[PDB]
Write a protein that binds this ligand. Structure first.
Ligand SMILES: [Ca+2]
Ligand SMILES: [Ca+2]
Ligand SMILES: [Cu+2]
Ligand SMILES: [Cu+2]
Ligand SMILES: [Zn+2]
Ligand SMILES: [Zn+2]
Lengths: 151, 151
């Protein structure tokens, strides 16, 4: 697959549609998320596309190379660490990220896994607390969706 | 992936959880669906895991070998043709299917695609009109979900 789509939904007001497109060796992630409190929000690909217990059964960040949590520009990061999205005053986060590590096929494929938008901003593993190196202290999962193959 | 899961949800009361497990060289589909009218309901894997327009954006039956619609035991069938699930008097359908054409990896992988439960019985491509050769006359999509990787 070369195109993917994710519909984020949660127990609250956060909702959004993310599109993924394979462009050479990068994946271009676009879309918008709304109902977010203005500010930065942790945006990551969790390991399982299991929504049987809402966003909790999505597990941890997709980390096939068992690295520490980082930000997207870092080398030592989880494959799912896409950093943060920023909600404007109206709660609207417009997504536009280009990542060279997540993929739509092969081993790092994220098809079938879950996109999660969090409550607080991802500290990018620079928080000086152990939690920071595991989840970036992004807190609760507001909305999530399974990533599926798109036309 | 050797395990997958799908949460079916729609606009009505139909809902359920379907689990998929690669056991040997085959795929075992289990789970239960509730909220259904008594009787048979078409149950198929649709091509796209695109829930942006509800179950409508799932596209047609997954059909990589370009065949016509059939029942699960037919040679001429789409890969996504899982036949009918049957709901009892309380609207509960118990799913137990072993299928030789779907898989959880490779060309016949259903990860990232959508599982749909339909309003009417699937006629297994034997109804005699053109629609029977496409969808089995199974009608509208009552509930659907993107198939994701499970732990
Ligand atoms: Ca929190
Ligand atoms: Ca119908
Ligand atoms: Cu996360
Ligand atoms: Cu169908
Ligand atoms: Zn991480
Ligand atoms: Zn079919």
């Amino acid at each position: 697959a070369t195109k993917a789509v994710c519909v984020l939904k949660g127990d609250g007001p956060v909702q959004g549609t993310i599109h993924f497109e394979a462009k050479g060796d990068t994946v271009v992630v676009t879309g918008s998320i709304t109902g977010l409190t203005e500010g930065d929000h942790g945006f990551h690909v969790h390991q399982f596309g299991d929504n049987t217990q809402g966003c909790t059964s999505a597990g941890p960040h997709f980390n096939p190379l068992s690295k520490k949590h980082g930000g997207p520009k870092d080398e030592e990061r989880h494959v799912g660490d896409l950093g943060n999205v920023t909600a404007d005053k109206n709660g609207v986060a417009i997504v536009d990220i280009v990542d060279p590590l997540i993929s739509l096929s092969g081993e790092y494929s994220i098809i079938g896994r879950t996109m999660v938008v969090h409550e607080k901003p991802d500290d990018l593993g620079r928080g000086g607390n152990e939690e920071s190196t595991k989840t970036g202290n992004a807190g609760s999962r507001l909305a999530c969706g399974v990533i599926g193959i798109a036309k």
